[PDB]
Ligand binder design. Structure first.
Ligand SMILES: *C(=O)CCCC[C@@H]1SC[C@@H]2NC(=O)N[C@@H]21
Ligand SMILES: *C(=O)CCCC[C@@H]1SC[C@@H]2NC(=O)N[C@@H]21
Ligand SMILES: [Zn+2]
Ligand SMILES: [Zn+2]
Lengths: 671, 671
């Protein structure tokens, strides 16, 4: 931020380390954009219709119309299911004016909330609140939408009521128009406070959801029946919702079921219905077409280059499948197809992060992994070292889901099943064998917490013989911190003081890391994806942007060879003076490469399940009973105990006080 | 087949050269098949029904069937659209028994015709008739389908009549049962004789097809109106078709048009309808869903891994969308999903051959490149130098279609527009200039033949100002070959002599080269994909199947770099013993400069648009202007005489007669 002495450090560091394999070439997605009249002010519609009509009038207007609306999910959910949620502000912010000035007929644009809040701090290192202001400033004539999880505003644990109230108030203040609300399980009493808080402020609209799972049409279905959804919808409506919505996380909604459900909901109630689904199993446009022929009022689709597979159905097909008929959307097909090149180039830039899933898969009807989780789950598996064992990770996922009854696997309760499956695969015990003797097994902390009822009762009922056996003897007790004196009063002010308090109350570690990083180098939200992820080439010049009236040029001419043990140096050019920098190689240098022997087959040896940090506590001898805990292993968003399958003695222990461990080498030996 | 000495030569030769670069570790796709007893005969399927009811009654039975029929195109079109057309018969033959014993409710399997005949001769050196015989032997309870082009048959240009009749008789004698007659430019006159030839066999269903183009429900333009298709269907029905079809090569059939088009046809003619469509724009299952709600009786699908984008919609989606409803398909979703592992492994094996698109696109409404042509066209463009300029030709394709009297484009009439577009991306001139003054701009040997009238006449009509100017003053010399007296007598006999005669008549040069290879290396259709394509690795096991009752085990040990002698020496084990072998080093020995001098700054520099063998007829002096043919540049199936620049004086020709030159070089200089 301060001149270039600080940013150059980060650039040199990322250039030297750069944990990626080669690079094909440099792309500039900006170079492929249409030509229009940015100078002229944008048209109006679909946003001013709420400020001069009223939050309740908007629902009446939307329901009584012959044209079906559209929402663009390209901004949060499209890249969450394909690129593992690694799209920066620079990127999907230069095209916002084009979308505003070229497609005024949009109903809204889903841009905020979801899993982006975590990542923005943890990985991309940029204040989330800044993105929202810029997006609002760029699209001043279309309503924005948010995703909310009831009492788990953004996270995986219940939060106090005051925090949720302050968060909704602040989000409305900075700018939002539609709030989508859902709960992990289908329990209304766990999301009532959010609805009440949204209604209190007026202006913004409330919109409750009802997660979908199973299959209605199947005669054998007896848990997630139609009456279940009807009663849930009745509770939603009488709670005070302005709208009703359906969320299909995985894409298990078929045409006939959608027709029946939408018809019943429209018949029994007089509120607009909003739809949403991922396109994993195949072509899901049939569901939308069948739905809007019997009711419904809106749909969700993303750009064609980022559509299909795990992401959502394309928008061009939606527009083209209802033209020249009573359901004419109003958008222009030529207008909406003029931006595909930009999104295609943008996707081409994010090659290394593209985990995704190459093509349709008909096996999603078995494991039911929701979209928007395959990419992140694959990244997590790759990190732990179990990368190329993903057919074994899907089977364990299905088994774990089956053993626990039948859960509504959505964002908060999907981490539980994912972690349980990873633990089962890493250890070596199959899911069906976990239920028989869940005593000599290391349950991760999150899974154990779920079994204590901290996320509400499941809709099917607890497993009677499994819950009791897996909880006895694990010391079920943990206190919680509270807002003592200052955070209570800070959450009442408005400005850039409540935002910091919210950030620090939601994620302490990420936020302090982000503060330290920003204090070390400076603001880094004005760079391109290449400059931030890959670093610097040689010879070619770069354009670094900081602020209006400020611009700098950087260039790389040579890189010094790795010194014996001193340091590595690089030289850059800020148009002159060939300013050098000093950086260190955390990968080129290698220590003594002699890992401890890894032994298998012998029943009297203790390995490590997956890679991580081990803090072993044990003494020589000290006869250990079967199933007793020995050491704890901690990894990214995970922590599990490790137990000795067979009783005996300790004999030899060969592990440092605290050090990383391979897939598994040796922890303790028993006889 | 062989004795080992010959096959070893082929393996050693392929191990050297092998332009494909580094490859991952070996993988066996044959280890992921289901488990079941392969000794019981497959259940009774649809071939028995066809034999019992005859060709006529089968159509009547299909007409009054509530269940919607299904077809499997994984064998012919799924790998034609995605993986060029390279799928050796060895891979396919290993899953046919499982498909026959697991999914006996399929209507038919499309596994021959269209474009396999040529590639299976000149690239994958094997005999198509043997592949057909093997596939028939594998599946004795499912009808086999074929794509026939009427006069063209399986070639590109017209063929005499006795050849087509003999071809049909041989094909129906060797196993095929269901033919799909279609013509590029919709006119019953062209394809009338083929229908009569098919009907004379006695048991073979003639399914005529009508192409779809433009849009039906849009009132904008009225050329391809509903009346046009109604008249065409009337003509087809009066011709004597057994079943009516609707081939949608590009994938431009939307729901609102589809329902009307199908409903109108069901209320006049009592024939069944069969629909075919690609999945290029987006989710195309909506078209099927809206079609069988109106009276459609069949649809085409494909294996889930080889589905989406340019291929047909997934088969599992088709089975699921019609499950537990009145239009039940009959298949079992559990059984279908059990074969995906094999297909995905197989696609992983054929990784080097990959063409098409990475994600769904919405701009197919602009260029309208048929599905099943973009892949085989990308491979054609790479070999001519144009490998990265694959987006700049979309506007050229659109222009070529527009200037030429909007028309229908299937394989014979789309090979012409593609050639024109490829030639128009050479010198650098645009479509509008070409239409303005066609005389100056040169024309390929395919477009000229189309304009002459050898192919037909579009429904729109020959453009007046263009045709008369693009024919006169150029030439017209297209002689016709005559059948040898001793050759025609052979076509009246059944067996293998007729098969060889047909092979020579349809494709002379590929047949000669295939015979040469057969003499040189013996049979090679029993090898696996890895061995045939790539070669051999370092010390390992290679289970090689030579023929019945012999399983030669082979393994490479050491390759000796050529120190002085250009020849290389490789030693290969054969049942324990060792045997040196000698192979050439064609790739290694390559050293030749080339002065391109293709700069566009100074006119008069005639540059070869693409790479190939160029013949020059102009000598020193003899100054000429434009229009006159200067050199007959030739390349992969594309005789395109090069244009002529403005007049001047011919001084230096930097090329000898024939000679080799690459795209972007200098052929003749004038001034
Ligand atoms: C760190 O990267 C946070 C966890 C990743 C996001 C998780 S994966 C499981 C949930 N589903 C989803 O879409 N996001 C959540
Ligand atoms: C030479 O044989 C090249 C491969 C075959 C080309 C095929 S013919 C059918 C498709 N249409 C087209 O234009 N090319 C494809
Ligand atoms: Zn979603
Ligand atoms: Zn096709």
């Amino acid at each position: 931020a301060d001149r270039g002495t600080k940013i150059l450090n980060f650039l040199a560091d990322v250039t030297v380390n750069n944990p990626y394999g080669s690079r094909p070439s440099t792309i500039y997605p900006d170079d492929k954009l249409p030509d229009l009249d940015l100078r002229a002010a944008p048209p109006a519609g679909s946003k001013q219709r709420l400020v001069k009509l009223g939050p309740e009038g908007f629902a009446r207007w939307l329901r009584e119309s012959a044209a079906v609306g559209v929402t663009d999910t390209t901004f949060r959910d499209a890249h969450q299911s394909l690129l593992a949620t690694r799209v920066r502000t620079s990127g999907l912010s230069r095209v916002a004016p084009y979308l505003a000035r070229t497609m005024p007929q949009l109903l809204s644009v889903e841009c905020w909330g979801g899993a982006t809040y975590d990542v923005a701090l943890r990985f991309l290192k940029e204040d989330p609140w800044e993105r929202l202001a810029t997006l609002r400033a760029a699209m001043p004539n279309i309503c924005l939408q948010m995703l909310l999880r009831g009492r788990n505003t953004v996270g995986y644990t219940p939060y106090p009521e005051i925090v949720t109230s302050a968060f909704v108030q602040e989000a409305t203040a900075t700018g939002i128009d539609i709030f989508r609300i859902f709960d992990a399980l289908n329990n209304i009493e766990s999301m009532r406070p959010a609805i009440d808080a949204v209604r209190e402020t007026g202006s913004a609209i409330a919109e409750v959801a009802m997660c979908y799972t199973g299959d209605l049409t199947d005669p054998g279905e007896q848990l997630y029946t139609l009456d279940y959804y009807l009663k849930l919808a009745e509770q939603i409506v009488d709670a005070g919702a302005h709208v009703l919505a359906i969320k299909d996380m995985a894409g298990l909604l078929r045409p006939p079921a959608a027709q029946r459900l939408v018809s019943a909901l429209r018949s029994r109630f007089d509120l607009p219905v909003h739809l949403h689904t991922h396109d994993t199993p195949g072509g899901q446009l049939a569901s939308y077409v069948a739905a809007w022929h019997a009711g419904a009022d809106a749909v969700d689709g993303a750009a064609a280059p980022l559509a299909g597979t795990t992401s959502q159905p394309a928008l061009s097909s939606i527009v083209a499948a209802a033209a020249h008929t009573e359901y004419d959307t109003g958008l222009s097909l030529s207008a909406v197809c003029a931006l595909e090149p930009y999104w295609e180039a943008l996707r081409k830039v994010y090659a290394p992060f593209e985990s995704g899933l190459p093509g349709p898969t008909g096996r999603v009807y078995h494991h039911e992994i929701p979209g928007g989780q395959l990419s992140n789950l694959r990244q997590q598996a790759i990190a732990l070292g179990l990368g190329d064992r993903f057919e074994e990770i899907e089977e364990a996922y299905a088994g774990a889901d089956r053993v626990l009854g039948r859960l509504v696997k959505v964002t908060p309760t999907s981490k539980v099943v994912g972690d349980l499956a990873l633990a089962l695969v890493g250890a070596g015990v199959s899911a069906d064998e976990f239920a028989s003797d869940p005593a000599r097994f290391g349950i991760p902390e999150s899974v154990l917490g779920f079994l204590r009822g901290e996320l509400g009762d499941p809709p099917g009922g607890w497993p009677e013989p499994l819950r009791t056996a897996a909880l006895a003897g694990r010391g079920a007790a943990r206190p919680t911190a509270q807002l003592a004196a200052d955070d209570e009063i800070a959450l009442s002010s408005v400005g850039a003081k409540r935002q910091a308090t919210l950030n620090r109350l939601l994620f302490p570690s990420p936020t302090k890391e982000f503060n330290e990083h920003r204090e070390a180098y400076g603001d880094t939200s004005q760079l391109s994806a290449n400059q931030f992820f890959y670093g610097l080439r040689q010879g070619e010049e770069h354009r670094v942007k900081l602020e209006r009236g400020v611009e700098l040029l950087i260039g790389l001419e040579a890189i010094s060879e790795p010194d014996e043990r001193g340091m590595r140096t690089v030289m850059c050019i800020l148009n002159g003076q060939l300013r050098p920098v000093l950086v260190r190689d955390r990968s080129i240098a290698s220590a003594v490469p002699a890992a401890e022997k890894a032994d298998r087959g012998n029943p009297g040896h203790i390995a490590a399940p997956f890679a991580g940090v081990v803090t072993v506590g044990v003494c020589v001898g000290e006869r250990v009973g079967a199933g007793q805990t020995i050491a704890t292993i901690e990894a990214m968003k995970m922590e599990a105990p490790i137990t000795a399958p067979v009783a005996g003695t300790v004999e030899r222990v060969a592990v440092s006080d605290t050090a990383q461990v391979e897939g598994g080498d040796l922890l303790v030996v028993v006889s």
